[PDB]
Amino acid sequence: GLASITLPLPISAERGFAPALALHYSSGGGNGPFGVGWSCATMSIARRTSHGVPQYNDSDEFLGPDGEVLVQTLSTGDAPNPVTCFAYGDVSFPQSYTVTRYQPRTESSFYRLEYWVGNSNGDDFWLLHDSNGILHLLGKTAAARLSDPQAASHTAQWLVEESVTPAGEHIYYSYLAENGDNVDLNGNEAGRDRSAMRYLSKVQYGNATPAADLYLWTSATPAVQWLFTLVFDYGERGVDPQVPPAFTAQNSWLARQDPFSLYNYGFEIRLHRLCRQVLMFHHFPDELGEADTLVSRLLLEYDENPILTQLCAARTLAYE
């Protein structure tokens, strides 16, 4: 489409169901976690802003996985919309859910998209059954939701949090909330609520044993053995090409020179972080003698300045 450069990520994809993510450059792109022009975002459902800031009520419109304008599926006698759901498959829930099907207003699609709202606590998320038979939970937990810091029920973006194939293969996405680590909280940074932003942190896949049900139906964090972890690091592990980065971060993430805030959702979303590297980890402790094995390191070099940060170089290192 509008992307004119693709930088692949070092994703191990020989064992079937793996994330398909890459860095894309667009000359018209704005700033973000990869500086000006570059982007690598996961799938999401979002509230529309083109026709005004959402009010977080009934009058809001939503956008589908490809940005298409959505509309509630017309409710009929044979297929009422919304429905009340007490369970999904073999998993029964502590609370029932009002489930509303949404579909593209004018664009073509072949999926089933649903908005789930808890009848007892109001916790809301999205469920997508896409044209390839993969089932996605988006924004199942608050950690995978871009929400108003002063009103957690006001979510602007539900980020994809878990995907499952018909064969029981899973992908689990983890996100980190923005904070004030290494930020001088005086002057221009005083009184700013900076916890809204969500950065992609870990993509875990290759579950040891197949499971048909989405893990996030049952728990807030899946307790399973993953074989593969794609880590997006924002400086916590160190950017020295001579020193290999450890799996668990010992330091806090770096603060960028060009922080900025976004406001079209009706609350502040401030960005202090830049993704410095993308790491590929394998988890074969029995056959390798260690819990975490780094196999590939995509190191990104930036031109950092207070006006704009621009990616200038990239390369994939190995430490054998």
Resolution attained, angstroms: 2.4
Return d(Cα 161, Cα 175) in angstroms, integer.
9
Residue count (the chain): 320
Q: How was this structure determined?
A: X-ray
Return d(Cα 194, Cα 177) in angstroms, integer.
9
